[PDB]
């Protein structure tokens, strides 16, 4: 029921960028839906980050910057720290479920 | 600031009912704006959204599980109610009660989940 | 002495040394480093 | 810092100076000893109205919060208009 997909692993040295990326199918979920993002730390609840693919609540800081273009989204990370390890999510709405749908869950390591 | 506090069994022999509730303070149920929901995920797994569910009683709902869970709401005790039946092996995860799916202004595909439960481990056994 | 950064090139041709060689020789890089001073003159030293 | 700048039977090691004809500039050092001068007399010398420049700094292990020997190092960085000598441990990645 993974109509998103993500990169299982992502790894990067820390203070440096790195780019998640989650897109779907064509039938399901289309130009006009939009994609959040998700933090979990392990054994936590999951954090929102951006919603809206270009905005973010009060205390996001403003290092984690999203876009979505067509289908396909990404997240920029600048300057890695070593607390931003974590399971990070993408999720958004699928027309032909019309339920919301969540990524496989990508692996972020700090190097 | 709005806290969830759901509880149930953390062990259901299978084969019946599975049932836990979510708790909402500093705020109340009967908000009519935003919605609320039940979002389960495996160990080892993603995010897998279960249904959510209006004051009133009408519910969202994942095809996938229809024949197996039902969601009840009450607004007198502010309580958010999940009930699972014929839970397997497969259903070995942590819930979480979420509010999300603003109803007055964003529609139905910009819905972002917005707060979350602390969670419960919840496993079968024989 | 371009923007300060002292900039030093050599090479040490073998040809003999009768007289001032004809054939081409490069020059390598050997040091560039951020001296900060403006220079204009110049002189050399000797030896005992 | 009390493992290094305390003993037993007390250390007085460290001076530190409590008059001077003057305040001090940024970034000076004022190496003396001068006797501070009480009226109008000359006197070099210790006792009353001749006061030695500098004190003690008498460390024991056992003082309050206030009185321990905290060690301080302080960083001064000229960030102006000059060729760059000293800068941060740039990060490295793999190669791939
Ligand atoms: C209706 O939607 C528009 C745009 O989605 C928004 O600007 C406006 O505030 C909404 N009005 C109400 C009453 O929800």
């Known amino acids: 029921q993974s109509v998103l997909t993500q990169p299982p692993s992502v790894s990067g040295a820390p203070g440096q960028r790195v780019t998640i990326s989650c897109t779907g199918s064509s039938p399901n979920i289309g130009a006009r839906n939009d994609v959040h993002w998700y933090q979990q730390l392990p054994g936590a609840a999951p954090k929102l980050l951006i919603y809206?693919?270009?905005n973010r609540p009060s205390g996001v800081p403003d290092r984690f910057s999203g876009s979505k273009s067509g289908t396909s989204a990404s997240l920029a990370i600048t300057g890695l720290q070593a607390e931003d390890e974590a399971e990070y999510y993408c999720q958004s709405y699928d027309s032909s479920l019309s339920g919301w749908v969540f990524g496989g869950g990508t692996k972020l390591t700090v190097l | 600031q709005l806290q969830l506090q759901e509880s149930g069994p953390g062990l259901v022999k299978p084969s019946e009912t599975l049932s836990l509730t979510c708790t909402v303070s500093?705020?109340?149920?009967?908000?009519?704006?935003?919605?609320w929901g039940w979002v389960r995920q495996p160990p080892g797994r993603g995010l897998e959204w279960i249904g959510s569910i209006y004051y009133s009683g009408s519910t969202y709902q994942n095809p996938s599980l229809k024949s197996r869970a039902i969601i009840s709401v009450d607004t007198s005790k502010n309580q958010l109610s999940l009930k699972l039946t014929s839970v397997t092996a497969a259903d070995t995860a942590v819930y979480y009660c979420?509010?999300?799916?603003?109803?007055?202004?964003?529609?139905?595909?910009?819905?972002?989940?917005?707060?979350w439960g602390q969670g419960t481990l919840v496993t079968v056994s024989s | 002495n371009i923007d300060g950064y002292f900039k030093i090139y050599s090479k040490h041709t073998p040809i003999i040394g009768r007289d001032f060689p004809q054939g081409f020789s490069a020059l390598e890089p050997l040091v560039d480093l951020p001296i900060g001073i403006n220079i204009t003159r110049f002189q050399t030293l000797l030896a005992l | 810092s009390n493992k290094l700048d305390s003993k037993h039977s007390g250390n007085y090691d460290y001076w530190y100076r409590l008059f001077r004809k003057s305040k001090l500039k940024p970034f000076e050092r004022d190496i003396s000893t001068e006797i501070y001068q009480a009226g109008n007399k000359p006197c070099k010398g210790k006792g009353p109205n001749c006061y030695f420049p500098l004190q003690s700094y008498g460390f024991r292990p056992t003082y309050g919060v206030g009185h321990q020997p905290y060690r301080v190092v302080v960083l001064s960085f000229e960030l102006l208009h000059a060729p760059a000598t000293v800068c941060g441990p740039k990060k490295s990645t793999n190669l791939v």
């Open positions: 500093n705020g109340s149920i009967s908000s009519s704006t935003f919605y």
């Open positions: 979420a509010r999300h799916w603003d109803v007055v202004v964003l529609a139905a595909a910009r819905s972002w989940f917005d707060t």
């Open positions: 809206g693919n270009s």
